[PDB]
């Protein structure tokens, strides 16, 4: 009936629609306070690295970036 979507961020079957995309339920909250790209947001690499667990203090500007990936809007 539907493709089933999940944490377009970082996760899996996300709680439901809050930004404009099926995005998780914690890791959302990530991207509340991180919106904006004003941040000393930065990766220990900046290379490369797919985004996945929480934790909310690894990959947290790829978490971030990857969120206006997503193509969210804080809402
Ligand atoms: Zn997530
Ligand atoms: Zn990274």
Redesign the pocket.
Known sequence: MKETRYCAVCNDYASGYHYGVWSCEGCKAFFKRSIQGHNDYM?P?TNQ?TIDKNRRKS?Q??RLRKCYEVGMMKG
Do not use: L
Request: with cysteine; proline share 0%.
């Open positions: 990766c690499a690295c990959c500007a790829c």
